Amino acid sequence: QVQLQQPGAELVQPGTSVRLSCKASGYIFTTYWIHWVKQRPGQGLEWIGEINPNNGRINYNEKFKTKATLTVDKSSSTAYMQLSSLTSEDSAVYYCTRVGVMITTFPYWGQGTLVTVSAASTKGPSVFPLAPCSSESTAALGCLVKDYFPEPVTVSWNSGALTSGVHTFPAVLQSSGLYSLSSVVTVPSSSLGTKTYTCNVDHKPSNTKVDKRVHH
């Protein structure tokens, strides 16, 4: 099976350089050009450049000529991309791809490395209840998961037992460089007097686990 293996993520500081790897298997490495593609969160694909692993010939997109540097290691069938002088504009998923038997195609893609460029230090979230002051058939409750770094956190409700009507929103990066997210759940108004609601918030990087009871 043709496979291109890439690390899931790289957390790195602005102003430094980072080396992304793409380990190929299941075919003759030197037969097919390897390309790299950038995709910023929620935006489009951008073509970085291509390298011929057989001879090291490389064509860059002019936009990336100083930012990206392509190499391969023939002996370990691995393609590398170094990104230099990192800034927040470089935070993105970076894919490696391999051309097909028709050279004008990308049939094979790595799963991509998520590179996040930040000067922020690890920090666990504060968890605050969300409950209206409040008639209606549906009540909402939630937790505000604020001021943490880095991504991600996992939020569950009642230890996983409550999944219906749960919405956990995408985190937003505040100007402080910390993340903030809400997780909410809607439930029948009638349950408010009989059932308890607790959000379970887990943040591995800080080794933080918070369970917060939300009183309607």
Place this chain on the structure above:
Amino acid sequence: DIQMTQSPASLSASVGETVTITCRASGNIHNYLAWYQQKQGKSPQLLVYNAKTLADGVPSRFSGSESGTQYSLKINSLQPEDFGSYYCQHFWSTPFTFGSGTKLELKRGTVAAPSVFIFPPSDEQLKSGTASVVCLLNNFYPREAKVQWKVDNALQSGNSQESVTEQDSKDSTYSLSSTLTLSKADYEKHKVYACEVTHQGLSSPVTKSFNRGEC
């Protein structure tokens, strides 16, 4: 340099419908044009190449066509698995550019008004010197909604952020959170905190509010 101009940026369609996605090359790229599909949080996958050849495994409801510098991806009888993003890419000269993308979302048969809820800042957060106020718009369709924060009936700006979920696979709705963030001192200047919501499912805008100190 050859650039690909893709359109439309967004498409809403129901299962069983047909759509057309278009890309114009800014110069002759011959037949060197590929199409890719990408699902949320997955890598893109090849759909079509040489402008009109289906990749292995791609169902025949997909077709690619070429007319000079105009290229089209057509999908007949859309199925649930077809929703997501689509990109064209040329491979003629360096750089091998992608179109800007098309997001294909599901058109729910009927409009669904948001259920709206407002959440005051907690006593605990207030201790720390900040007040986050959260407005939730739950399970609405279509995606377009206007959320406006009003403080003592004055319109707010530049102090809130919105976040939205991925369209629900089951009911085709979205939910959205808008967070208003104020220092404790600013929070304590005013009494009435309200979020006003405009949406196609609401004959009149809906306003949910609380009074600081009420809860």
